[PDB]
Design a protein around this ligand. Structure first.
Ligand code: HEM
Ligand code: HEM
Ligand code: HEM
Ligand code: HEM
Lengths: 141, 146, 146, 141
């Protein structure tokens, strides 16, 4: 439960995303919107279209938060507290949606980083995302 | 499941390039590695103690191929999914006692494996169609549980 | 769903004893209190900030009765949930965008409320049949999502 | 999180359960076996029939552990560590089953303690059981 070998697989993997972090973030979002249309309801005010700039901008924000999370794996609830308030109290995002986003992020990583997305890495990534997700919905538990 | 015409086509195009010896083993293997409780069902398969142990496991690989065979079947009968998976449903419920949530997990792992293999070719709209397919298979397998 | 006549009878008998005024509001209110993200869909009902607000909200109580009315229809057409619920599925998917996982949550809350209302009469075998029913209604309501 | 209001709610409901704790644990298990037959595989050598002495006895053990969890609300990961080991490492219980049993325990409590099972207590109990479940499935991440 973010476990020593888990970071490092996470840290290394986030490492190769590097400068692409934002575009992968946007891709994951677009992937989520198309596969799980119910999710688009939370973004009334956006242009959810492909290539969309707002989605591009949002992608960056999402990716930046994840980078900060990786950099703070051991202190995730303090580091993500504001986001937790936003997501649970303000937006009331359905907890299920976090699993969908997480899934779509993995899909994005697998498609872009074949050589890095090994089974072991996939597993660490999955737990990392689940732990981020738990923090983000902590306000309902 | 309801696929548009573009989707049916996209699904078909990709499936044709899928390596049937490998993909099934990969998907099954990753399921065992990512969701460890699933190992309970494959305890007599040998060493499952590490990611490489699971993935290169001859029995996992062999079993993955059958699993993939069944998916192929579903793809070829999108309009009669329940009929197609009727015996497999009974088998998974009555004999193996697998919770149906695991069919959803396997379908998603499968999606990650298709992405891994096809990279950029596995676009967002293609993934969406595949998501509809895997959700349909999971549902058809859960049919005899109620 | 697959119910025997015995399950059918047990389900039907209990249901004829339900007090809809009391059960409906409890069911819906508990959903909103227990799984708070659900309140997002009912913002137009007013104030739902605390349990007391929710449970005392007349709209919540009224809507709850309607919900129960839909369950009554499905009980009256057990072999064709899919048809019975098509219109409602459309409403829930296309217009409301509710994730189908919540259909399952509501079904489960309904099960606790029936136990609450009926006590010892809500035996284990009767609960087992109700679980099948709630699963079926949840699936029928998720129909347009696929 | 388990807010002090929640802790209070749990303590009061559990205190009311008092001596019937074992009977309630047994009933929740029987409810689970009938409603979700897939869970029966985990008890191969048990007489699962209605009223079985083994189910009664196991029900009592479950009740005890919950009693203990209530007593160590603030330090559950420690008070249940051995149990997590047992369930996750040794038995490999599918996480979904903890939800099923939690639901069944809630149904049992509602059937036996109508005056006490208010909406707020129900919410508190659900959060408590989710916590216990998280601890018992912590070895999977
Ligand atoms: C990996 C999990 C997630 C992360 C790291 C994340 C991160 C963020 C960040 C950094 C912001 C910007 C807040 C600000 O600018 O102050 C944001 C806003 C937002 N998030 Fe998320 N989020 C996650 C999951 C979700 C999910 C699953 C949904 C819904 C399907 C969602 C919906 C929203 C919305 C609607 C906003 C506000 C958008 C706007 O500014 O209009 N988020 N999120
Ligand atoms: C889309 C989901 C799945 C499909 C299409 C599928 C398909 C199959 C097929 C074709 C067989 C062999 C039947 C035959 O040739 O006799 C089988 C056997 C089996 N399945 Fe699955 N299955 C799926 C999900 C799962 C899951 C999620 C698990 C457990 C985690 C599981 C556990 C097993 C086991 C334990 C057996 C028999 C193993 C043995 O040979 O000892 N299945 N499955
Ligand atoms: C699975 C069990 C469900 C049943 C049988 C059910 C049934 C109904 C019915 C009969 C109506 C009234 C439709 C009309 O007037 O045409 C309705 C409306 C509605 N339902 Fe559901 N529903 C279910 C689940 C849910 C859930 C889980 C949610 C949200 C978490 C939800 C959100 C709503 C909303 C927002 C409306 C419209 C209320 C309004 O604005 O007047 N429903 N439902
Ligand atoms: C609230 C959640 C649970 C609690 C507090 C709990 C508690 C316990 C305790 C106190 C024991 C006995 C430990 C010992 O005697 O060494 C036990 C054993 C066991 N539990 Fe659980 N448990 C829970 C959930 C479950 C679930 C959901 C399952 C599977 C559906 C399960 C399956 C088992 C099995 C198979 C054993 C060993 C019994 C035997 O082989 O004699 N438990 N549990």
């Amino acid at each position: 439960v973010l476990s020593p070998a888990d970071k490092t697989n996470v840290k290394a993997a986030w490492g190769k995303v590097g400068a692409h972090a934002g575009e992968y973030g946007a891709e994951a979002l677009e992937r989520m919107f198309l596969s799980f249309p119910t999710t688009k309801t939370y973004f009334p005010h956006f242009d959810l279209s492909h290539g969309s700039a707002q989605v591009k901008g949002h992608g960056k924000k999402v990716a930046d938060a994840l980078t900060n999370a990786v950099a703070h794996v051991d202190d995730m609830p303090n580091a993500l507290s504001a986001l937790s308030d936003l997501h649970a109290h303000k937006l009331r995002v359905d907890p299920v949606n976090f699993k969908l986003l997480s899934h779509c992020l993995l899909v994005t990583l697998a498609a872009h980083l074949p050589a890095e997305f090994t089974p072991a890495v996939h597993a660490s990534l999955d737990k990392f995302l689940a732990s981020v997700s738990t923090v983000l919905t902590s306000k309902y538990r | 499941v309801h696929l548009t015409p573009e989707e049916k086509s996209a699904v078909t195009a990709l499936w044709g390039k899928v390596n049937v010896d490998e993909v099934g083993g990969e998907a099954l293997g990753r399921l065992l590695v990512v969701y460890p409780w699933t190992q309970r069902f494959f305890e007599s398969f040998g060493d499952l103690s590490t990611p490489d142990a699971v993935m290169g496991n001859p029995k996992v690989k062999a079993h993955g191929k059958k699993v993939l065979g069944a998916f192929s079947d579903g793809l070829a009968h999108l309009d009669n999914l329940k009929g197609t998976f009727a015996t497999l449903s009974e088998l998974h419920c009555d004999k193996l006692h697998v919770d149906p949530e695991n069919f959803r997990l396997l379908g998603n792992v499968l999606v990650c494996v298709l992405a891994h293999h096809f990279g950029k070719e596995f676009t967002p709209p293609v993934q969406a169609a595949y998501q509809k397919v895997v959700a349909g298979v999971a549902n058809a397998l859960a049919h005899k549980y109620h």
